[PDB]
Design an enzyme around this catalytic site. Structure first.
Site: not given
Length: 358
Positions: A61, A117, A147, A149, A315, A340
């Protein structure tokens, strides 16, 4: 390096590596504008390849900081405006829930609950359109931050549309090349595979899997040298000669929304410096970082504040990365690891090092 930097870095990172059982790590501390490098362990355990200043790590990220800056550069070029509705760039998004969702909402995770996601079944552009058309927001735009993606990922893809360039071509020509990040990649070329570290998850060597909008949200790989240069560029944007890029960097650090003590930029996240370390160390934990949080609009956005702790965690299944810097102090740090490990441990170490250097 000056013994002070050597000692604080080693006294902080050595214990971290042992406690988290990290196979390989690279750290860059930017002090008074100059970089100092440190490396430990293995990039490839089986082949006994050590981590070096040339080793490529998956940024995860942290890639979103590049996406945010490329978007800012497009705004500076006059190609897009953050106030533009998403449909201006994807007319096919005719579903009514999209009325009112702007590029600013996408870039800052405030569109109303876009998911973390993009589903794995999404392959084609038509699969992607179906996913966004069928998505049902939980909240009105610009009210809560989640948050995601799929949020900043779509922002990246749309931001480069007017340029007619692919996201990768735009990133290489408009950001990587101008800043001389010559060992930073969205797709690792065969010639550089010798330098690509393996990530480790439950003892197994792994690399990030291809996925929709991966380039835009978590697909960049880079070296500790290029990441130090990336930090220097964000610390001192005025030194950048390309006008729209200098501007884009500044726009990525503008404060658009506030949630608790944190401010959302484009990719970058910021807090006022001096910061309460418990405010960021704890805040980094996915418990708080990925939670649904009401946001207060900053109307109009505050231009990049020099006295800020600016950072981003990242990560992938096999890598953990962290970047933080304080413009006012010309100080910064990059931590790249091929395992990670908990975000709090990353922030704790960065804070201990940067606080010690003033």
């Amino acid at each position: 390096a000056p013994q002070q930097i050597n000692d604080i870095v080693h006294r902080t990172i050595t214990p971290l590596i042992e406690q988290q059982k990290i196979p390989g790590m690279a750290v860059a501390v930017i002090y008074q504008g100059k970089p100092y490098y440190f490396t430990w362990g293995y990039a490839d355990i089986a082949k006994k390849q050590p981590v070096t200043q040339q080793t490529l790590f998956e940024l995860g990220s942290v890639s979103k900081t590049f996406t945010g800056v490329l978007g800012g550069d497009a705004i500076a070029r006059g190609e897009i405006k953050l106030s533009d509705p998403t449909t201006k760039y994807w007319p096919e998004l005719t579903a009514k829930q999209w009325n009112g969702i702007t590029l600013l909402h996408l870039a800052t995770y405030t569109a109303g609950g876009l998911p973390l996601q993009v589903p794995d079944e999404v392959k084609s552009s038509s699969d992607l359109l179906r996913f966004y058309q069928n998505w049902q927001p939980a909240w009105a735009p610009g009210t809560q931050r989640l948050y995601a993606n799929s949020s900043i990922g779509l922002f990246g893809a749309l931001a480069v549309k007017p340029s007619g360039l692919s996201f990768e071509q735009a990133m290489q020509t408009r950001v990587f090349q101008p800043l001389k990040l010559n060992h930073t990649w969205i797709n690792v070329p065969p010639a550089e595979e010798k330098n690509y570290a393996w990530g480790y998850r439950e003892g197994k060597a792994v690399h990030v899997s291809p996925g929709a909008l991966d380039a835009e949200a978590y697909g960049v790989k880079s070296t500790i040298e290029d990441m130090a240069r990336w930090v220097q560029s964000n610390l001192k944007p005025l030194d950048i000669n390309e006008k729209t890029l200098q501007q884009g960097i500044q726009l990525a650090q503008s404060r658009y929304w506030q949630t608790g003590d944190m401010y959302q930029g484009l990719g970058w996240e910021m807090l006022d410096w001096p910061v309460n370390p418990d405010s960021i160390i704890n805040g980094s934990d996915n418990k708080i970082a990925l939670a649904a949080r009401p946001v207060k609009a900053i109307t109009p956005p505050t231009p990049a504040v020099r006295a800020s702790w600016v950072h981003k965690t990242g990560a992938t299944g096999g890598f953990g990365s962290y970047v933080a810097f304080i413009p006012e102090k010309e100080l910064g740090i990059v931590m790249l690891a091929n395992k990670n490990y908990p975000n709090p441990a990353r922030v704790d170490a960065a804070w201990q090092i940067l606080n010690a250097l003033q």
